[PDB]
Each structure stands twice: as structure tokens, then as C-alpha cells.
């Protein structure tokens, strides 16, 4: 029956931003399929005071069209909170506020189908046939994959017994963790430090042991200096994508400090808190680096975790009743892409050889990939501050026209000669 | 010549320009704006290097009334190809030259502005306000929105003073002359004076002049910018402040000076650090004096003879300076062109415009609207860029009868009235 | 046995005088403290609370950085100097500063704890100080350092119930958080710290939280560096020489210079209000320009009659908890009754403190720590000027200037 | 006359040793310095330049806060203590620290300025130190503190023209701004301060400003407090015990821990670029990943051959002015030639500095200040660990501890 211009699979910030940007475009009509009954953005990490790491301009539309009615500032105006935000004079919205803002934006759009899980994608008669778990079938000429990056746990914890959790479900399991006699957090990303700051603040009223163990060499901060922020730019992606595949993969091993790590102010608040608590006596906490969790066993409601200090070359074990795996996220190719696997391009490492224009299929403009492209677009791939730019390039290729102006240079420095 | 507009805006500063930007998509409103200068220009004499706004960029021409408006600072940055650079800069306060460039950019997009037009006479006839220009043109409108700003103020001691002294509003144009002199004296301790002092103190070793900073103020007090005090820049505080007695309001205007005047706290601290840095190499020939009012001045032998009095201590003293920079502020004066319609304007017991809560100054309560110059009725919000959109939205509401842009009634956590 | 001086009270100002006078052998002093050990406003030991002056304003440093009683040498001895080095924060925590003073007073032998002064007499060119236990000390000079007791409004004198002055907040916090409603009177630094503490857990206990003050705004502590130059020797020289009526009118105008709120705490309070208001309306009220004029206690509930002094309207507030954060005030200690004929007073009844911090007819017999805002402006209760004042006292007691006393420190001139 | 030790060189580390050993009567030391007086990188005395470590990292404070040679006591003597207190900045200006170090050296009795060491011999179980003037000193121990001389790329060895290393920038600034083009090579803190200085006057002189660096990014100095805990005694113990190949790999991947740009300075450079770009296109280039491989001089211009080592592309830059901010490197001094057999080397040819900072076969005869990143990681050139290493050196010299040597300062653990 009906054949749309494109189907959006998943409705996270990137595909929702595409939905807000394509809604006023008449000659371009797409639909978005989302498994959840409504938008929801990492609710398990809705800690008190938690905020974005990027300014409010990295919302769904502003960096492409500040006049769009779905901007964060327009959302604050409708809620009667714009003047209060003006006085707050903070660039970073709280996560619970950004999540409510996204739900508010998705509710203004009619191109979204909530409660719809894509289970099969087929290519028939020059059309992509999308089938959902409820049996509904959609057809279109292009696809925009925005399924995000699911949680990642070390394989040493796959099949582990007990009540251990990934950080993506921390808030729902907080009441149980604070009742235990010991808690161990694995990892040292931003989520680990937030949870560590959270549990360390109440370490007196509960009396547990708090262990923070990570494989990284240091609790390194997020490199947020402005000359480095210029690498989140179109001209750098131009230079980075043209590099040989071996150079891009070697860079990704050394560029994790540019988009991961801990907020510098959070590290300093954690030290200040440690200093404050230690005035009343020794604090029952441990912080270890260069230690990789290699195996874990459960018994009597207690975990025996085996680490190896890879730098020192020594093994040690830690016993703890609570286990929070703040081990990050990792993309895996969705199973619904199996019938069209022969139409998708791959690189010499088994991952999608994403084009400069964010395409992953043989035609070069049929299947578009949101996120999951660090090996081809560097730190800009999961960046909320580049979602409107990427959606601009996707709109430009889908439409042929540059509906939203796409900047070619933004940086004072040059990366290529 | 046969047209009757809904209103005529007199003067095109940031407040009336914001009204122009906000009424442009309103078809039921027919406005026209008359500006003396050939183009927009915003205190160009204070375009010192690095100088920036005291209010975040959301206090632009439209955003607090309509973030979706095409005349916002963010949309302007997007069009200039600078939006991502400002994103990385991560600074709420635009440069002054940047804000000026943005306002000229927005005025160029409108069709309702007549530049090079100086209003000389306003008359009332046939239930219409007749506005004559210096070129002889005549515009008729049902309403008026007055936005002529606040001209410079100099003390009575300097009226009819000889020499090359300057008010701070002409500093950038006279800077290359001032740095040649043997001594410079700054009078006043507002934000303008401190910016000039820092600029001249930064080059004190390159030019070898004495640098005097003398103020009538009791201290170099900072701009009170803490957030609970910022909540007084709100509509609910205006509701409270406006309905206070006239004597109470005039007393608060004398005491609320540190709320919207004074110096940025960061600038005061950077001044001290620079004094500390320069003092390492030897005595810095600079004087910082407070509680001292300039009572008399004369220009003889090519130099100035300033007579001060330390009002708190009660002792007179003199300062000799070849340069004189009066950073003594601005003050509104009733424009001459309103003379033929003073019978239709409402005044308080002090002789100033008894500006209504809805920003009207005429007898009907909705014919002549006043931008700025309303501190005695609207407190610190009167010259605040962060309340221009709010005032214009109330003005638009009185012109239409309907609230085109939503007008917030409460924004603050605290309460001011019981 | 007759000493050179007897110090009455052992707060930070007399303790600093103790550490500064220990190496001076030509001075014999003794200090009498009522309490068993040193304790500094322990009722305000809120979590994270810190000083409002940098650590260089400790007991000795601004007079002698080499003294062994410095905060830095204290940290060195506690194995915490390097951690403090990484902390890179000028402001010690309040519990830390209390522990530091306790560590310093207790390294000295000139302090007699558990000793309350009851009467002071002048008998043949000597000051004779008798204690509550009957013992008697004689000295040629006296150094009064008894501090400033809490102040409560007249509307609360003889008030029934369990209300507290903020100076006893830490002890009574467990019971206040049980109540259905809490009202804070005042808007100083103590009131805002308590408000921030109670607002942080307003969801946990679900009480209504009121913050009503007589101040016109929640004005911040004016802390910019050019204003800090008024905490200088040259400003006291200028301020003390002003006419007494000028000084008294100035004290009403310089409240924001030392009796406000830390600007960052004000901003933290607004952000917490903004944060909690996302979930729903926060049951809190913040009112200004309101004076507490009468209070009554009925069935564990307080009825507080307020008047908005600017608007001119009365209003009431019902609250089960009442925290008076209404500041402190110096009262003439009754043990000075026999020597009142030797003390100099001004036209308003307060001690006419000389520039050299003396309050007796000889200009060098009785010295007053603190309680001198009307003569020395904001420098009187300032920990940053405790070492300067003590070196001037030592200068009078010695005849020679032991510790170098700065004459000018500021870039600006206050006097012409 | 045979002393207990001879100090060779008088930089901050050996000057600190001199202040810490002055009150030790059981120790007889002497220090020999080539300069007529103390001078600390005066070629980098740009206006506003400050230390990157707090003032507690002075000559003595972290070992003995009571020492009369502390920065705070220097400020007291200069009548500048209160103004510094108002300044409330942890970082002294470089001109200030240089004046303070000169002040401390003039108070001491153990320094011979204008004395260059030309030879070191070992005979009769003593070290023989011969100066260029022919004077001969004997002592049981030696402490080497000759610093790290400038390093320039070998592509600039024997280069013609008026090019300079950044060590001499202030002396050549007047002539640099007259040229039509200036190129800075490298991206440490030195290069960034120079770029900011020249960019600030780019509208006054009309040169083109080039900033090219082999570094992959203009990375900031990692200064967050959990990383600062790696500058600690416990991290040195863990680090030194690691295998030698592991230590040499860490020195390559820890340049951002002490050899970056101050984060505030990066953001200021970007803001200045934003500001000046408002008026028009600013004539400046910033390039990374580019190594300088060849350089030749023509008339009064330089032709520089660069290679972007990542993109794999050669390019050239035409520049009249050349400023090499390429860092510093320790080379073994020639005066150690006769005693090389008594020194210990590792597999790479560098000194195998022990945990107690010794480099001689006896493990306690010759100590090395600085020049030990491969053995003590980022603490080796750090002013914040100068008093600690000097306290250990004094412990080895005196046989036991004189100043308290902390065993643990951090909250985290590095060894398991
Ligand atoms: C706690 C946290 C905070 C972060 N903060 C920031 C920040 O401040 N700035 C920044 O730049 N980055 C940030 N990131 C990184 C990144 O921007 C986010 O992870 C972001 O959510 C990624 O957007 P996405 O749409 O690609 O993924 P997601 O938000 O995970 O979108 C995936 C969506 O697709 C749906 N879906 C999945 N499979 C199917 C299917 N088969 N059919 C239909 N729907 C499906 C899912 O239900 C989900 O709604 C943060 C990440 C985390 C975890
Ligand atoms: C240097 C400086 C910086 C400031 N920065 C800020 C800030 O960051 N934030 C803030 O909130 N406030 C700020 N202010 C205060 C205030 O917002 C400004 O003074 C602002 O320019 C006032 O706008 P206005 O339109 O009322 O006056 P103006 O900008 O002065 O507008 C008056 C205009 O009307 C024209 N005009 C006058 N008479 C006539 C006539 N008869 N016919 C025709 N045209 C006429 C004039 O030519 C002029 O263009 C600043 C003030 C100064 C001086
Ligand atoms: C919570 C709080 C925090 C403050 N923080 C700062 C700050 O950071 N910086 C600053 O500059 N100022 C600060 N102040 C203000 C002021 O410096 C302090 O109040 C300071 O404690 C005053 O010192 P004092 O010795 O004069 O008074 P106190 O510290 O009160 O000393 C009085 C002492 O004398 C004893 N005493 C009283 N009567 C007798 C008697 N008859 N016989 C014997 N002993 C007696 C008392 O038991 C007590 O020990 C703060 C005040 C408060 C309340
Ligand atoms: N709005 C916000 O503030 C916010 C909040 C959360 C996340 N984010 C962003 O989301 C992204 C991910 O953040 P994240 O903190 O959730 O995850 P993350 O940054 O990827 O951190 C994962 C941590 O787990 C460690 N790890 C992995 N496997 C391990 C093993 N076997 N044993 C021990 N440690 C192991 C990793 O060490 P290695 O270093 O060796 O890999 C790493 O330290 C980042 O880009 C972040 O900026 C932002
Ligand atoms: N965006 C920006 O950065 C910026 C720049 C400039 C201005 N502004 C704002 O514009 C407004 C005016 O600023 P402004 O600094 O130009 O003026 P101002 O704040 O009014 O300062 C005037 C100074 O001159 C003093 N003075 C007046 N008459 C005197 C006399 N006879 N003798 C000695 N001193 C005398 C005044 O002392 P008294 O205190 O006794 O009156 C006062 O200190 C302010 O609200 C300001 O915030 C903002
Ligand atoms: N280490 C620290 O950070 C720290 C902590 C606490 C205190 N301090 C210092 O200790 C001193 C005292 O602090 P504080 O906050 O406890 O006292 P405070 O500064 O004197 O504040 C007292 C408050 O109570 C108000 N008040 C007085 N009588 C009232 C009445 N009848 N009705 C309503 N309100 C009334 C006052 O309003 P009015 O303005 O009208 O008088 C004032 O707002 C200050 O100098 C402070 O800087 C420092
Ligand atoms: N307190 C202060 O303000 C201050 C001031 C100056 C210095 N310092 C400290 O002194 C130490 C040295 O600082 P520094 O800035 O003088 O030097 P530096 O940190 O060692 O920086 C040297 C720069 O020159 C580059 N380089 C070397 N050879 C090159 C070549 N052939 N071609 C291109 N680039 C080349 C290096 O690239 P690579 O990255 O590949 O090596 C590096 O970027 C640091 O620890 C610093 O913290 C402190």
C-alpha cells in the first residue's frame, strides 16, 4: 500500500532529532518505530543532580535550525521555566529535564510509532521491508538505523549468579545496594564516578565498604579544553575519515580520553569528599587502577571477584556483596539486518565501513547509521553535539537539497595539509 | 502620506528594535520606527577590546518572548557560520561589538524602520498622534512607543568646562589622545569606569602617565549578581514594587544602585591582580580614591584643576591631570518634541513620568508607551536587556487586546508581597 | 605572683595571643577559659561547612609564618599536608579548624581550662581577677576575649517550646526533621547553611520549610578584592578617626561586608530549588523585609506574627519548628561591675575602644578582643585581623614592637 | 677542608636542599653555581606568567612549614603578605618566585656563585670537585643539581640566522615582532604562553603567526586531583619497582601528566581567537601531528620542512621568525667523565637512580636532583616533590630521618 521515504528504527536522541528536523519538510515523509511505549533516555542513570556533558545547544534541532519549535529553549518557554533557566545560568540541563524535554518533543510529532520492535528487514523490489514483532509491515526506499549501543559487560560476568547489575539499572537497585555490607564498582567512566560519588556521600549512614576498581591506567578526566573540542567538527571528520583504516583503529585506542572518562569537576568533588570524610576517621573505601576483572563467582549472597593488576603483573581477589558493572556500552549488529546483510558494506575488522555521508550499504545512500561509527567518524559519532549535523547530512542525501545549512569549517586550526 | 499606523516607535535602540522584531510577524499590527542614525549603533564609544554584555545572550531581542523567532542571537550565529564556534566558546556573554553586529543584522531584515529620521515635534489632533520629523515628514499613529534611551550625564561642576575632557561614551574615539598625556583622571566607579581603568592600567608602563581613579561612591562595590537577587528582575517583583508608595519607590531607587550598577566582580578582581602584578617591578603611579565628589573644575595652562571633597571625612583636596574622563553615567531627560502634548502625559509628585504598570505614560493608560527611563516605577528591570522582550510583550498585549506572546506572571521561587 | 596580663576567655583571638606570646620570654601571661577544652561554634558543624577566610588567617601566620602553631605546620604533623596540597582549597573545613585550634591550645602551658571569671577588681595599680572556684590572679593588664553570645529578638524572650538559636542547630537537628513544618528567622550565613541542609532532605521528611528574614534581600557577602582592602591597617586608622556618629551610621551600611551569605551558597540554594522543582512544587517559602514582632507556643505549634516592613502589611506563619538564626551581640560582662569607673564609654553606651584596642582610662590597661565594630569596623570579628590586633596588643605590653606591624597594605587611599 | 657534601648547581632543588640543611649543625655542605646569582628561566619571564604548582611547593614548606625560608615568610618580610592574602591565588608569578629564590639564597652561607664545576675525581674515598677558576673542593658525597639544558631538534643543529630556543624568548621579543612571519614549533606550556603573547599583538605588528607541533593534540596538563595523587611517595615506590621496560613505556605515555598546557591557558587562546576573528580573518595557522625534519636559512628567512606523521604528507612553511619551544633534555655533564665507573647505568644508557635518589655504586655517595623520569616518573622535575626528595637525601646523608618523610599521602592504591 503505502511506501514511505524512509523508516527510522529506534527513537533515541538521534532519530528523534531527525524526526523533529524532517517534520516541517513536506517533500520528505518518514516514519519512526520505537520499541518502548514512550521515549526514555537512560532512566537507570537518573541520579540526583545528574546533568548532560554537552551544553543545551546540543538539543534535537538547535545546531541545525535555532528557529525550530522543538528547541530546548522553546520547551522551557512552554513550561513556564525559561526565565528560571536564564537565572540558573548553567549550560548543562539535568538528565531528568532533558528526558522530559525529549518526551515533550516526541509527543508533538505524528510520525512516531511507539511500542513497535523491528524484528526483520528485507530488500524486495528496490524497497526495504521492515517487519515488527506484532506482524506489521512497513516499506520504504531508505532506512535510518538508530538503535543505540546496548550495555556491555565483561564475558567473565556472562551467566553470573546473584543480584549484580549494570549501571543502566542502578537507580532501581539503589535501595538494595545500600543495605549490603560491601559494594564494588567496576569501571571508571562518567557513570562509575557518579555512582561512586553517590554511594560515598551516604557511606556513614549505611556503613558498607565501597570499592572502585577499573582497568584504565588512571581516573583520567574528559579532555574538555576548547582547542580539543575543535576535533568535534566537520573538518576533522573529513580528515579522520580519509585516514587509512589501520590508522583510524589505532587512533580509537588512544582517543578514549576525548569522549569518555570522567568530568573534571566530578573527580575534584570526589577527592574533596574523600578529604572531608577522612577528618572523622579512616574511610572504608578502596580505589584501584590498572586492574582488569578476569572472573567472578557467587556464593552466600557474596561475590568473589578475581582481578589482575596488568601493569604490576599480579593477581588479587576482592570479596563484596554488591557488584555494579559500570563497564560501558558496545554496539552489536542487530539480528533484524541478517536478510539484508549482503547489501551492507563491512571493513577489514568486521564492522560497518560507514561512508562519509553516514551510509552503510552498497549504493552509498540507502541505509544510514546513527552512532556506532567511532572507527569512521571518531569522537563525533555518539556526540549529542553532532546529532543535528549528522541529521543534516542524512537529510541532504535523502532530499538532494541542503535544507539545513551544513557547515564545512568551524575550527581555527587545520587538521589536514 | 494618507496612512495611519497602529503605532510609531521613536528611536531604535535595543528595546524598540526588539519590539520591531516581535511585531514583524503580527499582521494585525502596523508599526513604523524612526531612528536618527543612518544605521543601528549601540554605545560604540565603549567598544573596548574584550568588552562583553552583562546579561547572557538569551537577553537578545526576541528569545525570552519567542525562542523560535528568526531574529534570535542563535539564529544570527547560525547564519554567519559561527554557531559551532560559539558552542565551543561556551560563554553566556556576547562581545559588545558582536551584539552590535547582531542588532544591525536584525534591523536590516525588517521593512518597518526609517533611518536618518529625527523626530522634532509630536502633536495630538483628530484622536491621533501626529509626529513630525526634522526633514518635514509627518507620520500619524493611534499610539506611540518612546525609546530614545538615556543620554550621557556630566556633573554640574563640568557644565561649560574648557579643554578636551570626555564623557566615557566617547572613550574609544579619544583613546589615542588620552594615552599621550602625562596624567589621566577617571571620575566615577561604574562598570564603564572600571573597564577604562583596566584598559589604561594595562599600558601604564608603555606610556608613563599617572592614572587616577576617583569616585563619589563609598566603595568599588560589585554588581550584585547572586541568583536570589536576580529573582528581583521578575514580573512579580514589578507587581510588588509598582504598587508601593511613591516615596518608598524613590527611596529604593537611591538604595538599589548596586543591583544594576557597579562593577562586575570578576573585573574588580582582575584589576587587583594587575595592580599586584605591576607592583612587583616598583611603585605604580596610580591612585584609587572613594567617598570623593568632584565639586569644581577648571582648564588652565592646558591642564585640569579638579577640586574634590572627601564627603565622609570632610576634607577637600585637589588633583592635577591633563586628561579627564567622566564616567559619570547616563540620565533621562524629557525630549523637547513632547512639548505640544505634555497635557496628555501623567507625572508624579517629583515631575517624572508616572509610568503605569503596563508601561504607559498617557492619560488613556494605553496611548503612549515608554521604554527605559522607568526605574522609579519598574526598578532595575527598566534598562535591563533581559526584560526588553517581557516589556515589549506587555506593550504588544495592550496594542492588540490579546496576549500574542505568553507573558509570565511568576518566575521566582521566593515571594515579595504578602 | 603578678603576671604581665591575664587573658579572659580562650576563643581564636586569645588563643592566637597565647601562641604569639609563648616565645616572648619578657611577657608572662595566663589565660582562663570556662570550658574544659577549646570548642568553636560546634553547634554549626554542618557537613562540608568551611571558613569564610583563607587558612593564612589562622592563629599566627599573618604575624609570623614561621610559628610552629600555623595551620600548615599542624597539617604537616597530622600527615595531611600533602592531601591538603592536592585539595587546593584556601578554606579549611570548620571541624578541621576546630581540631587545629584544639591542637594548638593544648601544646601550650599558659591556659587554665575549666575556669570562669566571676569578678574583676582594681586594687593598687593591679587588676585582680577572681574565679568561680575562688582562686585569684593578679596582673598589670587584662585582655578581654569573651566573644559575642547569641542574640534573639525581644519577641522570643521568655518563649515556651523547643525553639533554638542557630548556635545549637547540630544538636537539635534530629528532632527538627521530625516536625511537620520548620521556620528559619534570619538570612545570614548561618541561616543559609541551615536552609540548604534542610532543603536537601525536604523530600525525605516531607516538612514545609520557611525562610523569613528582615533583611531587604538575601544579599551576598561582598568579597571582591578592592572591598577586601578595607580589612587593612590604613582603613582602621581612617575609620577610627571618623566622628562617632559617622561610624555608627556606617555600621548600618557595612552589614553586607561581613554579615551576608557566601555568594556561591546563594547560587547553590537556587540551583537546588530549580532541581527539586522539576519533580513538583517544593513546599518552601522565602520571604524578605519581614520582622518577627511576636511569637506564642500552643500545643507544640508556634504562631509567628510577622510584618512586611516595606509593604506595610502584617502576616502570620504557623510552624512546629523554629530556628532563630538572628545573629550574635556583645553584652558587657557582669564581672566588670567593680571596674566600670575605669572603663571608657561613648555616647551610645558602648566601649570607646581606642585605636590600640584599649577600653580603660590609661590607654593600656584593659584590652578588648572583638566587640569593636563601632570603632574598628569589619576588622573587629575578622579572623584575618586577629594576628594584627594581637601584635598591636603585644606592642603595648612590651613597649617594643615584637612582630612587625604593617602600616599600609592596600593599593587605594581611604584618607586624604 | 673536607665537607660532608658538595652541591653542583643551584636551581630550585639544590637551593631547597641548602635551606633545609642550613639549620642542621651536624651537616657541612657547600653549593657551587655558575651564575652570579640565582636566576630561574628569566627568558620566559612573560608578563603575568606564574607557577603551575601552588606556593606550598616552595623551597621548604612541604618538609618544614616553620622554616624561615618559606614563601609566606618571604612575603611577610617584604610587607606583601596581606596583599597576597587578598590576592587569594595559589600560584606565585614567576618574577615573584625568582625574586623569592634570590632572597633565600642571599640569606645563606653555603653558596659560591660564579663558580663552574669542570671536573669530578674520586680518590682517597672522597670526591674531588675542581672549578674553572682552579679551586678544588673535597667531600664525602655529591648532590647533582645542574638541571636540564634546552633541547632543539637535530634538524636545527648548526642552523644559520637569528632563530632562538624559547629559553631566550624575552630577550628577542623586540626583534621578533618586527618580522613578517613567526613560527612556533612545539606545544608545551612554553609555546602556548608565547603564542598567546604574540597573538595578542597580532593587530599591532602585522605578522603571520604559525604554531606547528609534533604532538597529536594541544592536550592540556592532566591536573585533576585523582591524577595528582600519582605525585606521591607511594606511587614512586610502586613505579620504581616496576620492570625497566615498563617504566620506559610509562614515560612515553605520561607526557600529559606534567608536560602539557595549562587548561585555562588553552581556553584563553581560543577565546582570543574568537574575539579577534570578529573583526576579520586572523592570519594564524595551528597545526598538529607535524614533525620538523629539515630547516635551512636564506637571507633572513627560514624554509622549514615538516611532515604530518599521521596523514603521511610532507609540507613546507616559509617563516622569517623561528621560535623552538621544543623542550629540555638532560645530557650527562662532562665533569663526570673521570668518575663514570662509579656511576650506575641501565640498559638504555641513563642513570639507574635508586629509590633513595642515588646513582653511585655504593647507593649513597652521589645523589641526582631531577633527570629521573624513567625512575621516579612525573615527580622528578616537580617543584612539589623537591622538599620530599631533599628530605630523603638528608635521611641518607645523616643516616636517619631529620624531617618527617611521609610514607603515604594518597587515598587510592597503586600496588596490590
Ligand atoms: C547516561 C548517559 C549519558 C550520556 N550523556 C551524553 C551527553 O551529555 N552528551 C553526549 O553527546 N552523549 C551522551 N551520551 C552518549 C550518547 O549520546 C547516548 O548514549 C545516546 O542515548 C545515544 O543516542 P542513540 O539514539 O544512538 O541511542 P539510544 O538513546 O539508546 O536509542 C536507542 C533506541 O532505539 C530503541 N530500539 C532498539 N532496538 C530497537 C528495535 N529493534 N526496534 C525499535 N526500536 C528499537 C531503544 O528502545 C531506544 O529507545 C550519554 C550516554 C549515557 C549512557
Ligand atoms: C556600554 C553599555 C553597556 C550596557 N550593557 C548592558 C547589558 O549588557 N545588559 C543590560 O541589561 N543593559 C545594559 N546596558 C544598559 C541599557 O540596556 C543600554 O543603555 C541600552 O542601550 C538601552 O537601550 P535603549 O533603546 O533604551 O536606549 P538606546 O540604545 O540609547 O536607544 C536610543 C536610540 O534612539 C535614538 N533617538 C534618540 N532620540 C531620537 C529622536 N528624537 N528621533 C529619533 N531617534 C532618536 C538614538 O539615536 C538611539 O539610537 C548598557 C549600557 C551601556 C552604556
Ligand atoms: C559559625 C561561625 C563561623 C564563623 N566563621 C568565621 C570565619 O570563617 N572567619 C572570620 O573572620 N570570622 C568568623 N566568625 C566570626 C568570629 O570570628 C567568630 O565568632 C569567632 O569565634 C570570634 O572569636 P572570639 O574569641 O572573639 O569569640 P569566641 O570564639 O566565642 O570566644 C569566647 C570564649 O571565651 C569563653 N568565655 C566567655 N566568657 C568567659 C568567662 N567569663 N570566663 C572565661 N571564659 C569565658 C567562652 O567559653 C569561649 O570559649 C564566625 C562566627 C560563627 C558563629
Ligand atoms: N551526561 C553524562 O554526564 C554522561 C553519563 C554517562 C556516560 N556518558 C558518556 O557515555 C559514554 C560511556 O560512559 P560510561 O561511564 O557509561 O562507560 P565507559 O566510559 O566506556 O567506561 C567503561 C569503564 O569500564 C572499564 N572496563 C571495561 N572492561 C573492564 C574489565 N574487564 N575490568 C575492569 N574494567 C573494565 C573500562 O576500562 P578501560 O579504560 O581499560 O576500557 C572503563 O574504565 C561516554 O562517552 C560518556 O561521556 C555521559
Ligand atoms: N555590558 C557592560 O559591561 C556595561 C558597560 C557599561 C555600563 N553598563 C551598565 O550601564 C549602566 C551605567 O553604567 P556606567 O558605569 O556607565 O554609569 P554608573 O554606573 O552610573 O557610574 C557612575 C559613577 O559616577 C559617580 N559619580 C556621579 N557623579 C559624580 C560626581 N560629581 N563626582 C564623582 N563621582 C560621581 C557615581 O557615584 P555615585 O555612586 O555616588 O552615584 C558612579 O560611581 C549600568 O547599569 C551598567 O551595569 C554595562
Ligand atoms: N565560617 C562561616 O562561613 C560562617 C558561618 C556562620 C557565620 N559566619 C559569620 O558569623 C557572623 C554571624 O553570622 P549569622 O548568620 O549567624 O548572623 P547574622 O549575619 O547577623 O544574620 C542574622 C539575621 O537575622 C535577621 N534578624 C535579626 N533580627 C530579626 C528579627 N526581629 N526578625 C527577623 N529577622 C531578624 C537579620 O536581619 P537584618 O539584616 O535586618 O539585621 C539577619 O538577616 C557573620 O559575620 C558571619 O559571616 C561565618
Ligand atoms: N609553570 C609554567 O608556566 C611552565 C612553563 C614552561 C614549562 N613548564 C614545564 O617545563 C616542562 C617543559 O615544558 P616546555 O613547554 O618548555 O617543553 P615541552 O613540554 O617538552 O614541549 C615540547 C614540544 O615540542 C615538540 N617537539 C619536539 N621536537 C619537535 C620536532 N622536531 N618537531 C616538532 N615538534 C617537536 C614536542 O612534540 P612531542 O609532544 O611529540 O614531544 C612538544 O610538543 C614541562 O613540564 C612544563 O610543565 C612550566
Author numbering:
A (entry chain D): 9 to 425
B (entry chain A): 8 to 425
C (entry chain C), D (entry chain B): 10 to 425
Text taken from the publication that reported this structure:
Herein, we report the first structural and kinetic characterization of a novel alkyl diamine N-hydroxylase DesB from Streptomyces sviceus (SsDesB). This enzyme catalyzes the first committed step in the biosynthesis of desferrioxamine B, a clinical drug used to treat iron overload disorders. Using the electron donor NADPH and molecular oxygen, NMOs catalyze the first committed step in hydroxamate siderophore biosynthesis by oxidizing a primary amine in alkyl amines and amino acids, such as lysine and ornithine, to N-hydroxylated products. SsDesB crystallized as a homotetramer with each protomer consisting of two dinucleotide-binding Rossman-fold domains: an FAD-binding domain (red) and an NADPH-binding domain (blue).
The electron density is well-defined for both the FAD and NADP+ cofactors, including the nicotinamide ring, in all 8 protomers in the asymmetric unit. The nicotinamide O7N atom participates in water-mediated hydrogen bonding interactions via water 679 to the E202 side chain and H50 main chain carbonyl oxygen atom. The side chain of Q61 also contributes to stabilizing interactions via a hydrogen bond between the side chain OE1 oxygen atom and the O2D ribose oxygen atom. The phosphate moiety of NADP+ is held in place by a salt bridge between the O2X oxygen and the side chain of K264, and the R232 side chain to the O2X and O1X oxygen atoms. In addition, there is a hydrogen bond between the O3X oxygen and the side chain of S224. There are no significant global structural changes observed upon binding of the NADP+ molecule (r.m.s.d. = 0.26 over 2741 aligned atoms). In comparison to the holoenzyme structure, upon NADP+ binding, several structural adjustments are observed among the residues surrounding the NADP+ binding pocket. At the interface of the FAD isoalloxazine ring and NADP+ nicotinamide ring, the side chain of Q61 shifts away from the FAD isoalloxazine to accommodate the binding of the nicotinamide ring of NADP+, which in turn, induces a shift in the rotamer positions of the nearby L230, E231, and Y232 side chains.
